[PDB]
Symmetry: D2
Subunit: 494 residues, 4 copies
Amino acid sequence: AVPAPNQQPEVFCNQIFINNEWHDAVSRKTFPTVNPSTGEVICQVAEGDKEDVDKAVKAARAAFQLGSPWRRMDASHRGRLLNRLADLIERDRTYLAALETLDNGKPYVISYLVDLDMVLKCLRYYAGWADKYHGKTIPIDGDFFSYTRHEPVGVCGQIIPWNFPLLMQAWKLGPALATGNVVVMKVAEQTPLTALYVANLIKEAGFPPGVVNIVPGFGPTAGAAIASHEDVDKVAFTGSTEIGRVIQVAAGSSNLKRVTLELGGKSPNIIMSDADMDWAVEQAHFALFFNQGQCCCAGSRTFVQEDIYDEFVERSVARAKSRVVGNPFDSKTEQGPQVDETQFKKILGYINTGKQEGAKLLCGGGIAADRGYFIQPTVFGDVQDGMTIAKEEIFGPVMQILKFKTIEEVVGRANNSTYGLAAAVFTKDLDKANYLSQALQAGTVWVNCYDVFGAQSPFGGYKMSGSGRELGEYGLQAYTEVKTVTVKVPQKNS
Amino acid sequence: AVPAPNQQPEVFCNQIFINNEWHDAVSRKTFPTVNPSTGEVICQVAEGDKEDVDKAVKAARAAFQLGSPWRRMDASHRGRLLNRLADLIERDRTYLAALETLDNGKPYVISYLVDLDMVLKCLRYYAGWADKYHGKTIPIDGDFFSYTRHEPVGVCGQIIPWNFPLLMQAWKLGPALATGNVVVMKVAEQTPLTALYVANLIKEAGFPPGVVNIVPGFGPTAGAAIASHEDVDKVAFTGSTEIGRVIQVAAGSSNLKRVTLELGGKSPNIIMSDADMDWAVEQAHFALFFNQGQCCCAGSRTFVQEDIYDEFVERSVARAKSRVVGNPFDSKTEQGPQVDETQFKKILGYINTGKQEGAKLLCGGGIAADRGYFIQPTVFGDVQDGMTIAKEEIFGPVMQILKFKTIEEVVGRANNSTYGLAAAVFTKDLDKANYLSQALQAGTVWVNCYDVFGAQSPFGGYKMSGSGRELGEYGLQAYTEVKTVTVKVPQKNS
Amino acid sequence: AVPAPNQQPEVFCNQIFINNEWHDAVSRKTFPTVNPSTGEVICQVAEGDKEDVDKAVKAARAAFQLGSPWRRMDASHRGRLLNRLADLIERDRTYLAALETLDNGKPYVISYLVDLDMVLKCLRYYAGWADKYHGKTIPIDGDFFSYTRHEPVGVCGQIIPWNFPLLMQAWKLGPALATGNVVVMKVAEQTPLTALYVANLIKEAGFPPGVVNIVPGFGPTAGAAIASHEDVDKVAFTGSTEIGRVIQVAAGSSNLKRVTLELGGKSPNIIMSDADMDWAVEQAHFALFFNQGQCCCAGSRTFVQEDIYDEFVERSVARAKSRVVGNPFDSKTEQGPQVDETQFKKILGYINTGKQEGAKLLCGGGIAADRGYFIQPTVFGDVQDGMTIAKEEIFGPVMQILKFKTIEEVVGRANNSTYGLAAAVFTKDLDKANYLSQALQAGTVWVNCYDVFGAQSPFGGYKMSGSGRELGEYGLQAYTEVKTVTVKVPQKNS
Amino acid sequence: AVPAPNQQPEVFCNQIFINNEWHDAVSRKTFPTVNPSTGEVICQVAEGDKEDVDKAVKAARAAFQLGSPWRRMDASHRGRLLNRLADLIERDRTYLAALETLDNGKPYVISYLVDLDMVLKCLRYYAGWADKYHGKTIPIDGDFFSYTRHEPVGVCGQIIPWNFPLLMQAWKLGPALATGNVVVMKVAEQTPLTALYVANLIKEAGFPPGVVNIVPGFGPTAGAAIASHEDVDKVAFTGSTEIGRVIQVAAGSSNLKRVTLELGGKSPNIIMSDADMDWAVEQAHFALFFNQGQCCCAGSRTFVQEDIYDEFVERSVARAKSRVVGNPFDSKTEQGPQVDETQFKKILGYINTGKQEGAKLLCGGGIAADRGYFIQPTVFGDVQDGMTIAKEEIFGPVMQILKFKTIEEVVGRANNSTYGLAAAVFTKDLDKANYLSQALQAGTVWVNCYDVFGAQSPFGGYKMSGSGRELGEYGLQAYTEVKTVTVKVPQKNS
Ligand SMILES: O=C(NCc1ccc2c(c1)OCO2)c1c(Cl)cccc1Cl
Ligand SMILES: O=C(NCc1ccc2c(c1)OCO2)c1c(Cl)cccc1Cl
Ligand SMILES: O=C(NCc1ccc2c(c1)OCO2)c1c(Cl)cccc1Cl
Ligand code: NA
Ligand code: NA
Ligand code: NA
Ligand code: NA
C-alpha cells in the first residue's frame, strides 16, 4: 500500500554540509551524479577534497569540546534529537524514497517499504540506546572504588557506499550520535543526494552545528583525506574489501585511529534435500537478485543437494525468466538499472567470464534495455568452486548454482572462502540447522530465510568481509572510549 | 570410575553449626535420622528450634557488620574461598558420596558421579562470579554523576529439601557467598548429615565465623523461625508448593523480607511421532525415574502422539520391569528406597488412587522389599488429564503415559496446569521444536533431552512452581541489594 | 513560561476502563472525589469492586493469549506505542497538570514543570527498552545449545498511591508495557481522575484492548481483589509499609504471584560541618517539604553536625516561616493542602505527639487555613532518635532536626531504622562522601543534592521500605519471566 | 616475609614451543639474553623467524579446527585448565620470581610480591570468565528467532614487551584462552626466559598441543611475521607507539586481521594544593620510579600547584636521593638496573637533552654503578611543556616536575599530548576530583593513588597510547567474534 511517487523529485541540497551550513568546495569544482535509468545527469554536486575535509574535521572537533552544547546535552536528549530526525524523515518519506530511486535505480516500492522503513527503525532503535549504554562499577581488590565511564570516541570519519545510501547513512549516524560522537561523513559520488537532504533535516531537528558534517566527493580524495587525517579519532568504512585494505593502512600510517570495516562477500546459500522446495526457490531468488544484486551479503553461492538439484534449478530459471526489469517508478518493476556504467560493464564482464570458464548459462546473460544500465536476470548452473564467478563478488543479477552431496562436504566448500559476511541454511531438520549454523564461518547465518535484518541484531564480517559489528547493542562498542576511574577510599566494604 | 564405598561410613558432625563451632540445641533435644534402606536409625541430630535460629542469626548479623572480615575481604578472595571449599569437598568425595547414599537412599554410583560432580561444578562456577557482578554507571539527566553499587542483601535464610541434600546446599551457598551474604541454613530432618559435614569443610576453607550457620531441625520449628525472623533479610525456600505459601505469608507478616521459591511440578514430557524412539524411551524413563522419582521437575506426564503410542508403552514397560531395585551401595542397583516412611506410604497411596480411576496399571504398583522403603517401578497407561495421578505431584517411581493427536492439543493439555517448573519436547523437526519451546509455559524447556542441568543455565518455576531463578548469572539477582548513589557535579559532560 | 491554568478543568473520564471502553461498576456504585483545597466534591467516580476487577483480569488474560495482537506485536512497536502515549500526554500537558492539582492539591507550577515532565521522561525512557532487554546464549557443559527467553511475567496488577498520581502511573506502565505484559491497575480513591484520562490516551495511542485496564475503587475491595486474584501473575504495590504487609500475605495465600513493594521511609539527611551552608539549608527544606511533605523519601530526619547546628536551625526555621501556603493554582504558592481529611488529621496527631514527647517546636505546629486541609510548615529541633516523630513516617510538612558529633556516630543513628528508602550527605570532602555513601543502608544516597530522580537510575527500598527497584534497566526485572531452552545438539564447539 | 631467592636459578627452557614440544629455530641460529645487573650472558635462546612462526601458526590453526579437543572442550573446563595453570605458577613462585629478576633486573621482592601475585590474580580472574561471556537472544522484528553466538576470534598473535614479562603474558593468555582461542606468542628478546618456563607449565596443566605456541626471536623478524601472517586472525601488540604503527600497517597490508595496541605514555600526575603532602609526594615517587621507570603509564609529568610547589620539590628530591639502587636480589634494593644497553643509552641521552634545554637538574643525572645498567634516580625541576623531557617517553628513573596555577590551566596542559594512557589527581576535594577525572583524556584516572591495577578493571590508551582495553570484562571483547543466527519461526510471540 504505497503513495504515488513524484517521478521527477526536485533537488534542494547538493553542496558540502559543515557547521549546519552549505558550502561550495574550496576549489569550486563540481561532479555529476546520474540517473541510472536514463543515463542523463541529475545535477552537479560540490566536489569535496582534503581542504574541505579539513574544515569539516575542525568543525566537528569544535563541537566536541568539553562544555559544548553537544557534550553537555543530557544523553536522553540526544535520544530526543534522534527521534525528531526520524520524525522529519517520515514526514518526507515519500519524497526521499523517490529521490533515492532517482539517484540509485532501485524500485520506488522497495525504497519506500524497505529502505525508508529500515532508516526509521534504525534511528528510532538507536535513539533508545542514547541513555542506556552503562559503564560499570567494579569490585577491584583493595581499598578502592573503581568504575568505568563510557565516553564518546570523538571525531568519527564515516565513509558510506552507494548500494543503500540512506540506510547506510542511518547505520552510521544512529550509533555515533547515540553515544555523543561527532561525525565527518563521506557519501558515494553515485548517490550523494539523499544523505545531503537528510543533512538539512539534521539541521531542522536541532543538532548543534558541527555534530554532523557531510563532504560529498571521490574516494581517492575525500575518503583518503578522512582515513589519514591526524585529528580523526575513528574511521568506519563500508565498501569493497580492496579499499578496506587502503583504509586500515592509512589509519596505521596516520594517528592510529580506531577502525571498523564492512566489506564484500560471496555468501553461501545452502539448500538441503529436506528443504521446503517452493519457499527455498523463492528465497534463493530473493537472496541473490535483491537490490539489483548490489548487496554485500548476496547469496551468490547457491549450494543445492543433488537429490533436488534438477527441480530446484528448473524452478529457479522459471522465476528468473519472469522477474520484471524496467522503470523503477512503475509499481510492477522488480529490478531497476545497475548503479552506473562501471558496474554495468563489470557485471557484463563477469557474465562473459562465467560462459568462458564452462559454467552453463541457463537464462539471461545480456543487456535488458537499450538505455540506462539494465541487465537481464542471469542464472549459471553447474558452477564449480574454482570458477571466477564462484569466488569473486559480481554485485549484479547473476546467480550461481552449485551441486553438493553431503553436509560435511558442503560445510567445507562453503567455508573455503576468504569472505565470511553471511550464509544461509534451508532445512526442516533441527539437528541439521544447528550443525550448520555452528559450523558456518560467517557473520550472520539465516535459517529458512535470507536478508533478514533488524536494528536489534548485529551485522558484520568474518575473515576479509570486515571487522566489527553494526546494529544492535554491539554497534555501540566501536563508538565508545572506555575510561577507568580508580579512587582510594578509607575502607572498601562489600 | 568409582572408588569402592564405605557402606557404613562414620558420622563426625551431628549438631548445630554457629560461628564455626558445634552446639547442642538449647533444649538439648535431639531427633533420629534414619537409613532409608533399612528403616533403622543412623544417629541422633541436634533438634534446632527458634532459640537456636536466634543464635544463628545474631551470629550471621555480626559477621555482616561493616568493617568485619567478611565485609572487607576482596571480592576475588570470596572466590578463592569457594574454590578452596570445592577442593576440600573433592578431597572427601568418596566419603561424602557414601554418606549421602546412607542418609538419603540414592545409589552410591549416582551420589558419586552425579551429585558430587554437580556440587563441585556449582561451587566452582559461582567462585568465578565473586568479582564480576558489576554495578552500573548511569548517564542520568542533569549535572550529576550517578551509579549503582551491587551490595549483598544481608542475612539470608535458606531452607533446603532432602532429595538432593548436598547439591541443594551448593545451589544456595554458591550465589549467596559469591555476592558476600551471610547464611542461616535449615537442612532437611531426613538428610542432615552431609550438609553438616560440609560445614566442617567451610570452617576448614577459612570462611570467617558466622558467615555460614547451619541449624538442623523441623519445619514448623526451625524453618518457621527463619521465615518469620525479624532480622533475616531474605529467605530462599525449596520444597513443596504447599509449604512455599507458608513461607511467603511468614515473610509478609514479619519484616517483609525478600523471598524466592523453588516448589513442586508436574512437568510434561512431549513425544512427537517423529522422535527417535529408542532415545525418547530411555530419556522418558530417565525423566521420570531418576533419583527414585524424587525430582521436582520429573517428567510425570508423558504425552505420546497416537501413531507411536503403542510401541512407546511396550518399550516403556519393558524398561520399567528391567529397572533394578535394591541396596544403593550395590553397583547393579538403579533404584534405592524412597527417603522415608511418610513418602513410602504417600506414593503407595497415589498408586492406589490411580488403580481406582481406571488407569491401566501396566507394571509395579507395590512394595518391592520387606526391608526399607523400596517401591516397584510403576507405570500407568491410558492416563487422562482429570485423573489425580495426572494432576498431583507423586514424587515416586510412578510413570503416567497419556495419548494425544495434534500439536495444538498437546500444547493446551501440557499448559493446563498450575505447575510450570519444566517441560520437554522430543522431535526431529526444527519448526515443531521452536513452536513448542515458545508455547510451553515452563521455567525450562528441554529439547530432545531431559534433566540437563548446568551451573551456567538458570532453573526456576512458572506459575505455582515457584518464583525467581537459581544457577547462572540469574542466581545472583536474589542475593543482591542495589544502591543508587547520585552525586552533584560541577558540569556533566558525555 | 507556564501556560495559565484552568482552575476548574472539565472531567471527561470517571468510569472503569476495560478493553479500551468505559464501564460503570457492575453495582452502579460511585464515590465522590474531593478537592483538598476547598474540601468540596469535584465529581463522582465508578466504584469498582471484586466483580469489576474480575472482568478486568479476564480482559487482560485475553489480551495476553499467544497469537493475540499484543503478543505478536514487534517489541520495537511496543516502543512506538509508549512513545505515542508520551506525545499525547505532552499534547494535553496543561490540562493534565491542572487536573492533577485539582484532585491532589500540589501547586500547579509543580504539576506542570515537575510531574508532567517526569511522566514524559519516564515513558520515553522505557519506550527505548522495549527491544533491548536481551536474553542470553549460554556456554553450558555438554553437547547442548542453551539459551534464555525473557518473556513477560503476564497479567500484572498495579496498585498506585495518591502522592504522585500521574508519575506513579508512568513508573508502573513504562516497564510493564515495554516488556509486553498486560495491566490491571488500581488507582487511588483520593486521586483517580488523571489516571483515567490517561486511559483515554492509551486508547487513542492504539494499544490493543485489554492491555491496560483501570479500576478506580477502594483498597480493601478493588485493591485486595487484585492482590488475592488467582489469575494475576504479578503484583506491584506502592503505599504504606503497613499495607505492603497485607499485599504480601495476600500473594502468599492465593497463587504465589510475584511481588514488589515501594513502601514508606524515614530518610536521613546528613549535613557535615563542611557543607555549603546556604545550599545545604535550601536542599534540606526542599528534601522535607516538597509536595506538602508527601514523599516516601522525604528527608524527615535532618542530621546536622554540632558546630553548625545553631546556624542551620536558625536558617531552616526562617526558610520554613517564609514558605508560601495557599491556593495551588496561584503561582505564588509553594505549598498546597494535604491530600485529604484523613491525612490532615494524622499529621495533626503527629505534631501533637512531637510536642508531647519533648521535641522543641520551633515554628508552625497548627492549621494554616479554614477551608481545605492546609497545615503550617512545622519544624522540631533537638529531636532524639527514640522519639516517635524521629521513627515514624509523618508524610506531612513536619521537619525533624537532630544534632550529631562524629561521622561514625551519625552512620549508626542514620542506619538505626526499619526503613531504608533513601539518604543524603552534604559535604565538600571526597573521603567523607565515599565513606557515608557506602555505609548508609538506603536504596538511594544523594550527595550534595536531594530528590534527584532520573528514569535512568533505579529507586527502591532496603529493609521495610520495600523490595525490588523501579526506574532504569532494573525496573524491567520484575516484569520479566525467564525461560531456559536447552537443546541437544550433535556436537558442541566453542 | 618473602621466601629467600635462589640468586642463580637454573634455566630449563630456551627453545621454540610448538605443539607442547621444544624446537630449535629452523636456521639453528640463537641469541644471548643478558643479566642486566652484571651484563653477563645468562644463556642462549632459539632465534625464531618467519619459518618458525609459520610452524606455530599451523599448529594453532590445527588445534582450532572444529571438532578438536580445544573446540569441543566445555567452557567451564577451559576455566579448570586456567586455574590449574595458576596453581602450577604458584607452586613455582619463588623460582619464577627469581628468574624474572635475573633476566629483567627488577628487585626480586617486587617480582615476588607484585608481578607474580598479579599473574596469579589475572589468570584466576579470567578462569572465572571462561563460561560466563554470554551471547544474546534478541527480540528482532518479524516472525524470527534471533540470537548471537560468542565464538573465538581464532588464531591470535600476541607480541609482548620486556618490562613486565610474566604479567604481560598473563594479560594476553587469560582472556584469549578463557574465550577458547589459540595463540602464537612472541616474547621480548630481552626477557624470553620466564615465558618459556610458563609454557612448560601450560603443557603440565593439560592444555592440548597447539593451543599455546611461543616463538622467541627479534621484532623485525618473528614479530613482523606474526603481524603480516595471512592465517593469523587477530594480533595484540604491547610496545612503543612507534612500533604499534608498523603493526597496524602490516594488518592492513596482509589479511585485515583485527588489531589491538597498548602503547606508550607521558601521563600527568596532578597535585592540587589541598592534597595530603606526605602521601602525594610518596605516590608521585612511586608513580614515576616504579619498575626502574619502565612503565608505559609512568607518572612522567608531575604537575604541582604553585602554592605547594617548592615544598613538594624539596621533598621529592629528598626521597629521590634516598632511593636505594643496586643488586635486585638484595632485600634493601628499591631500584635495579635498566633492561639493556639500548635503554641505558637512550635514558642518558634524554638526561642530556634535559640539561641542554635548560631544565634544572636537582639530583642524580648519570650512571649509578660501575657494573650493570644502573642509572641514578634523576629529578628535573621547573620543567616546561615545550621541553623534550616533558614531551617524549623516557622510560627511565627521570622525574619531570612542573608548576601550575589553575585547575582549568592544568587540564589543558595535561591533555596537550598525543599520549593518553593514564593520569592521576591528588586532592581532598569532591568537586575537584570529579571535575578532573571527567576532564582528563586518559584511559585510566587514579584519584589519590597511582598504578592501582586490578584484574577486574580495564586498562588501555586514548589517542596514540593505544586502542582496545585489557583486563576486566572489556578484555574479552577483542577475543570474541560475534555471530548472528536468525531463524524463521511459525509465529513470533513475546
Ligand atoms: O526486506 C528485507 N530484507 C532485504 C534486505 C536485503 C539486503 C539488505 C537489507 C535489506 O538491508 C541492508 O542490506 C527483510 C525481510 Cl525479507 C524480512 C525481515 C526484515 C527485512 Cl529488512
Ligand atoms: O524536582 C526534582 N525533584 C522533585 C521530586 C521529589 C520527590 C519525588 C519526585 C520528584 O518524583 C517522585 O518523588 C528534581 C531535581 Cl530538584 C533535580 C533533578 C531531577 C528532579 Cl526530578
Ligand atoms: O603495586 C602496585 N602497582 C605497581 C604497578 C605499576 C605498573 C604496572 C603494574 C603494577 O602492572 C602493570 O603495570 C599496586 C598498588 Cl600500589 C595498589 C594496588 C594494586 C597494585 Cl598492582
Ligand atoms: Na546517481
Ligand atoms: Na535419613
Ligand atoms: Na481528590
Ligand atoms: Na635479559
